[PDB]
Amino acid sequence: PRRDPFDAARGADFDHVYSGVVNLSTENIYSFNYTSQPDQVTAVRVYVNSSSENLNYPVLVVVRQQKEVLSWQVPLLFQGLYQRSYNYQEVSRTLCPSEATNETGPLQQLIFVDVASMAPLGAQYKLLVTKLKHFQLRTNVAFHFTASPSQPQYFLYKFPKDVDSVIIKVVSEMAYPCSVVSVQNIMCPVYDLDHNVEFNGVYQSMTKKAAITLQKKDFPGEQFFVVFVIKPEDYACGGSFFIQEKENNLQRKKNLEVTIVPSIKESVYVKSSLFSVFIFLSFYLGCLLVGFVHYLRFQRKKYKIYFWNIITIAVFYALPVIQLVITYQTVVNVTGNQDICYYNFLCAHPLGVLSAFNNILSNLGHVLLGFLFLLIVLRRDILHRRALEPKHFGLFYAMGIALMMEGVLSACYHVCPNYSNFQFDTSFMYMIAGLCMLKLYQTRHPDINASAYSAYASFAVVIMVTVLGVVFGKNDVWFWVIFSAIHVLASLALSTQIYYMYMDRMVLLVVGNLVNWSFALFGLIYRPRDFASYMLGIFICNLLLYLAFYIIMKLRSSEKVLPVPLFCIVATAVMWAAALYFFFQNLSSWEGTPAESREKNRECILLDFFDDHDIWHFLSATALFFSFLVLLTLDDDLDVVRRDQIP
Amino acid sequence: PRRDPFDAARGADFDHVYSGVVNLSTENIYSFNYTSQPDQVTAVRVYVNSSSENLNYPVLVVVRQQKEVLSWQVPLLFQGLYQRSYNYQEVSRTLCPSEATNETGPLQQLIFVDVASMAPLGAQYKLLVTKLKHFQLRTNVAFHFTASPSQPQYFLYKFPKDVDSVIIKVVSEMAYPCSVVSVQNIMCPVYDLDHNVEFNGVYQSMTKKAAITLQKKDFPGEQFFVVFVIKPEDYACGGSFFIQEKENNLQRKKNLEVTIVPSIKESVYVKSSLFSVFIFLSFYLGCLLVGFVHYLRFQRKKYKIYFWNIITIAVFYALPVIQLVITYQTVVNVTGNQDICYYNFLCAHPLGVLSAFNNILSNLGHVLLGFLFLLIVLRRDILHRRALEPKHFGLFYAMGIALMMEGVLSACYHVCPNYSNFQFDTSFMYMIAGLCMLKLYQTRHPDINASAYSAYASFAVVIMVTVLGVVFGKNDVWFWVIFSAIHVLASLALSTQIYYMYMDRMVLLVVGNLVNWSFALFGLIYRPRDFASYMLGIFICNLLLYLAFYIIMKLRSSEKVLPVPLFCIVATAVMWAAALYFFFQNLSSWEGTPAESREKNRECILLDFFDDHDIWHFLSATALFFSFLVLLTLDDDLDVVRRDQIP
Numbered sequence A, B: 001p002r003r004d005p006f007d008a009a010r011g012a013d014f015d016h017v018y019s020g021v022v023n024l025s026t027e028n029i030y031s032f033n034y035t036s037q038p039d040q041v042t043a044v045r046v047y048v049n050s051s052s053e054n055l056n057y058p059v060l061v062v063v064r065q066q067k068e069v070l071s072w073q074v075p076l077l078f079q080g081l082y083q084r085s086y087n088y089q090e091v092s093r094t095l096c097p098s099e100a101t102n103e104t105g106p107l108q109q110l111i112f113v114d115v116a117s118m119a120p121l122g123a124q125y126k127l128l129v130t131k132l133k134h135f136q137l138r139t140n141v142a143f144h145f146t147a148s149p150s151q152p153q154y155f156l157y158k159f160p161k162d163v164d165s166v167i168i169k170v171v172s173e174m175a176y177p178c179s180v181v182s183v184q185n186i187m188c189p190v191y192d193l194d195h196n197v198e199f200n201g202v203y204q205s206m207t208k209k210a211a212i213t214l215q216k217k218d219f220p221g222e223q224f225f226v227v228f229v230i231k232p233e234d235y236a237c238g239g240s241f242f243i244q245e246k247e248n249n250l251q252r253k254k255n256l257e258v259t260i261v262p263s264i265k266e267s268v269y270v271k272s273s274l275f276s277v278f279i280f281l282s283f284y285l286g287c288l289l290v291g292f293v294h295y296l297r298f299q300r301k302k303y304k305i306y307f308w309n310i311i312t313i314a315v316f317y318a319l320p321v322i323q324l325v326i327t328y329q330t331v332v333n334v335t336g337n338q339d340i341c342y343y344n345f346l347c348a349h350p351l352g353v354l355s356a357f358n359n360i361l362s363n364l365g366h367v368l369l370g371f372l373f374l375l376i377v378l379r380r381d382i383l384h385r386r387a388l389e390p391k392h393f394g395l396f397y398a399m400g401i402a403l404m405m406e407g408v409l410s411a412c413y414h415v416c417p418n419y420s421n422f423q424f425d426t427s428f429m430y431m432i433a434g435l436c437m438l439k440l441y442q443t444r445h446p447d448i449n450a451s452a453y454s455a456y457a458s459f460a461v462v463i464m465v466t467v468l469g470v471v472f473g474k475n476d477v478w479f480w481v482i483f484s485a486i487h488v489l490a491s492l493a494l495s496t497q498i499y500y501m502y503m504d505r506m507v508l509l510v511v512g513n514l515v516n517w518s519f520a521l522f523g524l525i526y527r528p529r530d531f532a533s534y535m536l537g538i539f540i541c542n543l544l545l546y547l548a549f550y551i552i553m554k555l556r557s558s559e560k561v562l563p564v565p566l567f568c569i570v571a572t573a574v575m576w577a578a579a580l581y582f583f584f585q586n587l588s589s590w591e592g593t594p595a596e597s598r599e600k601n602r603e604c605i606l607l608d609f610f611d612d613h614d615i616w617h618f619l620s621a622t623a624l625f626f627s628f629l630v631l632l633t634l635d636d637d638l639d640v641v642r643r644d645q646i647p
């Protein structure tokens, strides 16, 4: 079979459109010839059109280079998820470039394009082969382009000498189509197809936003390829089947803008760590100063088992979650799949094997303030015991331990947030609250009744409300039924609690009922994603309302308050308002697909290191500490009445 | 460029070897022609050989059919993991068949094969195109074949009219190379390459064994393709640098044998469920019978808060694990990746959305026997309270709840076992043991000391030993250090405990030390994969061994025993022996890669439903129940001594 390609290989030119017709007894060969100079990269792009009547007899296209062969067919055919098919009549591909070194010198390159078909009568085609002027990407310079499910794109980036780490930020002005962004190494071939893109590099599915962080040391040669591949359907990105438009002539054209920006330096790490440590060591320093001043001026002129049980429970609850999150982080590091953790990729600063270092360093406040509260409670206990030789000190010990464990579990959860972890930190608080309530009720004894046995009934209702939330997830009318059930339960539980402990009585009862109804309407506005956290927030705010009612009844001239109580309460109110502002900024969400969560990402504001969530962590820790301080030292004037005052 | 393929397309013959030389000015074209008859499937296979000097100028091969174009190059190039390359001189592929049905009638088919190269002098090649006689697979008939990294294979299976579910079992005699087995649907194209095989169907990585279960209703047309693809390196399958035989020219040939077998029916499900329920309801029936007999013959002629605390802890520990395993199962069902859960794939029988129904139904014994034990203890407590108007009843309630929770947590773990789940069920037991020991020590009071505070020191040593095991995993001499440490700790802890409670005393001390040293030797022989479970087993065996000294001392004519105690001890001894036998048959392991774990899979022996692990579950539950019964009813004869006997 002696065939000479050069006999019919037409010497073709770049940037020229060739029309043709091919059938069984015909085949078309085009020969393209060019030269590559040193220290310069040239990419070639091939475009083929064919009309859609060629369904049973497509047009087969083959591209031959010195070491590679590529091939496809027009129109491209895609298989849907629900037995549906799509066809695209325009196909474009970029051929893998070969860099030229000064030692090698300029090289001559030859390319062959073969177009064939098996149509009995004839198939029409149009061909166009061009060079790419915009192939190499520059730092800090935004680049716009367009992609299609049959026309994938990819570009080249070279690391600058000084830069040690970069971030690729990709933004589109509209979702649907949804795509995949991949980063791969230089060596050919380049996997830019739907069925092999998620094989080599690191990739992220995206609809409106995407961000990837890279380090120089992981790329030999200090260069990489960025590949953009569109998908035929939006099922994987939270959408439905094909959204046909007026122009859809099948095409899903997505307009994209890409930027590559250098990352921060380690001085930012040092400054952020020092600030975070000092802002909370200031509390210890101030407490020591106040104690020293009081000693200089004013002085001159049983529960152990209830502590060790909680310690044991905390340790043996914390260990497995630590192991699980370690496994998650290792898997994410190894595989390169970045759709596992729901980070805030715009301000996820890594350190070592850690992906988001800031989100873990932000939890220092919980631990430090819990330890300081434990120290204060221990001081009070020691002083009381020495004076005797103040009854619920075990409750305050449990409070401090719960604060510290909240910090620890939040740090564990933020290693890799997904939809299989929030439950641990949500449920530890339920366990601690149940233990504390049971111990308090037993310590109070029945005596009269006591009260009306509402506490364990409410806790049980909480238990199967959590069970029901586990069973049915956003299931028809069950959602509204359980929502109304829990709201009414909280309402009448607060009602009976305030009644069992006189116009102020029913005035405050009506106020509390109105506040609970306001909570109900707020929940009606925005549906609650998770039931356990919703109930926990309602429970905490109900306790705050009860504390407010208690202090308002104490402030009716029956008793007095020291400077420390009202200083603590005003600090608590201010800090709670400040924290509640930041609580409503959600930069990610495990409720939806990773792309939808990525749509909400935001840059960070404080010293270029901390986003809204870190500030929320800080403020919540401070507010909880001050609220606990209010709770502990509220009854101090009653010490004036001697002979075994209120405990 | 008008070119006629038929001018040089030599009419070629099947099963004939064609040799040739091609270069820049020469291209070889072969035309193959055949016919497909109705109700018959034919597949075509293409083979290309090329020598090794064609490194910079390979041979490019293109295959053209009516609706598909395929292409590759010889020698095939593969990229390693640490910057290495491999080249293969022989390539072969199977073309996607098109089945002809009676309404369409026989179809004439034409195929073109084009061979080209850009060598400046000349490149040699050899080509052979054949039909496949053995393409369709039959039921219960083994089939042998051979595969290579550059010669993937795949076959077709059609569901019989009556079989509703099948199992594909693949077996090879030697690992290294390690391969991938995939199941996909009928519609072309077929992904049989390293970079796209894990995209559409369901797949498993294998070295010696593989097993996949399929249901008919998931496949339109009731047929599928089974694809076998070998890998260039063994890194993903627990392997090191690829092994090269003395003979090998590079080629990693793998001999495989594949069988397809129908699955079991629902009658087995019904029979197994009935047997599992009744074998444990027999205990309730016998207890009721003995109570009725005792009533007919012999009669004719404070802790509440502890129970509720334990219940709260159990519930709020159990829930998040349930959510986590639900998420795991949903993910493994959706993504089709069967390397996530470490099942025993040879006897994993699905039901609904459950992948291994037997491994969960085998846990009924724990729950049922725990309920029976709790009922017995409650009866004893009620009778004692009625007689008064019997001290550690809270401890026995704790044991019953612990049996409940062991059953529940093991059932949760077996939903999808991997290297993230054993920690929960391991740690709950440590938490329960610590709480119970603390309660016992506090209630018994120091009085004298009490003892030497050995228990708290031992538990602390357990604490940071578990922490260290979390930190260092098989890290050089540290492994041996911690091993010797906890064996020594157990030895002297047991020595102190027995000494604090007389040649018999020294005899028993020597016996206990020798037993602990035997444990140390056994641990030296086989390394402990997990530290926490090793410590738990050591503690359990030491506990029943301490019970052994207790009874042997009690039978020194000072006191007697009733029929129930010695029946219980003989029962627990024999059932512990049987359970310990079944405990050493490991059919899966998360220590290694999924393929290495699959190497240990085994069929199931009991009623075609239950493997060895299920028998272990049953026997362990029964043995634990009888040991608890031994503990509860050991001191009954001393009730003869009235006036406030021992509590």
Ligand SMILES: CCCCCCCCCCCCC/C=C\[C@@H](O)[C@H](CO)NC(=O)CCCCCCC
Pocket: A399, A402, A403, A406, A429, A432, A433, A436, A437, A533, A534, A536, A537, A538, A540, A541, A544, A576, A620, A624
């Ligand atoms: C019975 C005696 C006291 C028991 C003490 C233990 C239980 C009280 C909570 C202890 C501190 C845990 C912190 C609570 C909540 C927040 O961290 C989280 C947000 O991550 N949940 C949320 O839901 C957000 C917070 C909701 C805010 C409500 C409005 C102020």
Ligand SMILES: CCCCCCCCCCCCC/C=C\[C@@H](O)[C@H](CO)NC(=O)CCCCCCC
Pocket: B398, B399, B402, B406, B429, B432, B433, B436, B533, B534, B536, B537, B538, B540, B541, B576, B580, B620, B624
């Ligand atoms: C201290 C007062 C009583 C406390 C009661 C609660 C704590 C004791 C443990 C209760 C039983 C839990 C189950 C134990 C073991 C097995 O399930 C597992 C293997 O699945 N571990 C294993 O290690 C296997 C079993 C090892 C057996 C060794 C030889 C008998």
Ligand SMILES: *[C@@H]1O[C@H](CO)[C@@H](O[C@@H]2O[C@H](CO)[C@@H](O)[C@H](O)[C@H]2NC(C)=O)[C@H](O)[C@H]1NC(C)=O
Pocket: A021, A022, A023, A024, A025, A026, A120, A121, A122, B002, B004
């Ligand atoms: C479609 O195929 C037919 C034959 O199957 C082609 O007809 C002849 O093609 C040769 C090839 O160069 C010409 O030399 C003859 O002149 C053609 N015959 C006639 C009567 O025109 C036909 O050319 C093919 N279609 C196209 C567009 O090339």
Ligand SMILES: *[C@@H]1O[C@H](CO)[C@@H](O[C@@H]2O[C@H](CO)[C@@H](O)[C@H](O)[C@H]2NC(C)=O)[C@H](O)[C@H]1NC(C)=O
Pocket: A017, A047, A048, A049, A090, A126, A127, A128
């Ligand atoms: C293939 O079809 C596309 C779409 O019909 C053609 O793209 C058009 O190109 C012209 C430039 O000559 C533009 O003015 C039009 O706006 C384009 N149409 C669009 C963007 O929808 C393309 O020229 C055709 N030919 C090739 C070789 O691609």
Ligand SMILES: *[C@@H]1O[C@H](CO)[C@@H](O[C@@H]2O[C@H](CO)[C@@H](O)[C@H](O)[C@H]2NC(C)=O)[C@H](O)[C@H]1NC(C)=O
Pocket: A002, A004, B021, B022, B023, B024, B025, B026, B120, B121, B122
């Ligand atoms: C290798 O290429 C050279 C030129 O590029 C071929 O030399 C001529 O090839 C044509 C077509 O095959 C023949 O008609 C001439 O007779 C060849 N010239 C000579 C001097 O032999 C050469 O044939 C190619 N190699 C092979 C094996 O065909």
Ligand SMILES: *[C@@H]1O[C@H](CO)[C@@H](O[C@@H]2O[C@H](CO)[C@@H](O)[C@H](O)[C@H]2NC(C)=O)[C@H](O)[C@H]1NC(C)=O
Pocket: B017, B047, B048, B049, B090, B126, B127, B128
């Ligand atoms: C390609 O090379 C292989 C290996 O050299 C050839 O396979 C040999 O085939 C013959 C029969 O023709 C056997 O007797 C040998 O044992 C085979 N060698 C092996 C398996 O290593 C093959 O024939 C060559 N040609 C083609 C077209 O594949």
Ligand SMILES: CC(C)CCC[C@@H](C)[C@H]1CC[C@H]2[C@@H]3CC=C4C[C@@H](O)CC[C@]4(C)[C@H]3CC[C@]12C
Pocket: A266, A269, A270, A273, A277, A351, A361
């Ligand atoms: C190799 C490059 C990244 C070095 C840059 C130095 C950075 C990574 C170092 C310098 C100061 C360090 C911090 C100093 C103090 C603390 C508080 C301590 O309780 C936890 C560790 C932590 C938070 C350190 C983390 C690592 C740190 C931020």
Ligand SMILES: CC(C)CCC[C@@H](C)[C@H]1CC[C@H]2[C@@H]3CC=C4C[C@@H](O)CC[C@]4(C)[C@H]3CC[C@]12C
Pocket: A282, A283, A285, A286, A287, A288, A290, A291, A376, A380, A564, A629, A633
């Ligand atoms: C025995 C009882 C009454 C002791 C009560 C605890 C005392 C020592 C605690 C409770 C509230 C504390 C204050 C709370 C907040 C601040 C603001 C901070 O920027 C400096 C420290 C300072 C000023 C703390 C000093 C110590 C403090 C006064």
Ligand SMILES: CC(C)CCC[C@@H](C)[C@H]1CC[C@H]2[C@@H]3CC=C4C[C@@H](O)CC[C@]4(C)[C@H]3CC[C@]12C
Pocket: A322, A325, A326, A329, A330, A353, A354, A360, A367, A404, A408, A411, A412, A415
């Ligand atoms: C009570 C106080 C002392 C508790 C302090 C807990 C701190 C030190 C623990 C809790 C959770 C831990 C993290 C859990 C998981 C991982 C992932 C692993 O790949 C690197 C270490 C890292 C990031 C751990 C670092 C240490 C860590 C932050």
Ligand SMILES: CC(C)CCC[C@@H](C)[C@H]1CC[C@H]2[C@@H]3CC=C4C[C@@H](O)CC[C@]4(C)[C@H]3CC[C@]12C
Pocket: A331, A339, A340, A418, A419, A420, B328, B331, B339, B340, B418, B419, B420, B594
């Ligand atoms: C040594 C290897 C084989 C251990 C296997 C563990 C890996 C493969 C498992 C363990 C935990 C798993 C993840 C658990 C939860 C999620 C979140 C979900 O939205 C997508 C699936 C995903 C991301 C799972 C993917 C597979 C996974 C990462």
Ligand SMILES: CC(C)CCC[C@@H](C)[C@H]1CC[C@H]2[C@@H]3CC=C4C[C@@H](O)CC[C@]4(C)[C@H]3CC[C@]12C
Pocket: A470, A471, B318, B322, B353
């Ligand atoms: C005592 C406590 C721990 C018992 C908790 C039982 C809960 C977790 C169990 C009992 C019944 C279970 C359900 C039974 C059936 C189905 C239908 C299936 O398509 C999805 C899972 C789902 C919805 C199960 C989810 C888990 C479930 C709700």
Ligand SMILES: CC(C)CCC[C@@H](C)[C@H]1CC[C@H]2[C@@H]3CC=C4C[C@@H](O)CC[C@]4(C)[C@H]3CC[C@]12C
Pocket: A518, A519, A522, A523, A528, A529, A530, A531, A533, A534, A535, A536, A537, A538, A541, A580
């Ligand atoms: C959405 C789920 C998953 C988590 C968040 C749920 C909890 C923490 C949320 C949901 C409803 C919220 C409350 C709704 C309304 C009010 C009244 C307003 O004057 C102060 C804030 C307050 C009191 C909110 C506090 C936080 C809250 C209790």
Ligand SMILES: CC(C)CCC[C@@H](C)[C@H]1CC[C@H]2[C@@H]3CC=C4C[C@@H](O)CC[C@]4(C)[C@H]3CC[C@]12C
Pocket: A573, A576, A577, A580, A581, A584
């Ligand atoms: C302890 C509590 C009751 C103290 C007072 C809390 C007040 C000051 C808090 C609670 C609810 C908060 C608001 C909740 C929601 C929003 C909408 C947002 O787009 C801007 C901030 C804004 C408007 C917050 C401002 C501060 C706010 C009004």
Ligand SMILES: CC(C)CCC[C@@H](C)[C@H]1CC[C@H]2[C@@H]3CC=C4C[C@@H](O)CC[C@]4(C)[C@H]3CC[C@]12C
Pocket: B266, B269, B270, B273, B351, B361
């Ligand atoms: C549609 C096909 C699969 C129907 C076949 C019937 C099978 C699946 C049915 C028939 C009898 C059933 C069992 C009957 C009793 C029990 C004990 C109970 O404590 C849990 C459910 C369990 C274990 C059932 C599981 C499902 C079961 C085995």
Ligand SMILES: CC(C)CCC[C@@H](C)[C@H]1CC[C@H]2[C@@H]3CC=C4C[C@@H](O)CC[C@]4(C)[C@H]3CC[C@]12C
Pocket: B282, B283, B285, B286, B287, B290, B291, B376, B380, B564, B629, B633
């Ligand atoms: C108050 C004290 C003495 C109560 C003692 C519990 C008695 C009633 C229990 C403890 C051990 C029990 C036995 C344990 C196991 C079996 C084997 C079974 O195939 C028949 C019932 C039988 C033989 C049980 C009968 C009831 C039994 C004897």
Ligand SMILES: CC(C)CCC[C@@H](C)[C@H]1CC[C@H]2[C@@H]3CC=C4C[C@@H](O)CC[C@]4(C)[C@H]3CC[C@]12C
Pocket: B322, B325, B326, B329, B330, B353, B354, B360, B367, B404, B408, B411, B412, B415
């Ligand atoms: C104290 C007794 C009553 C507790 C009984 C617990 C049993 C009924 C619970 C505990 C764990 C549960 C399983 C946990 C996870 C899943 C996966 C989900 O996709 C289907 C339900 C299934 C398979 C649950 C079935 C019911 C289950 C086995």
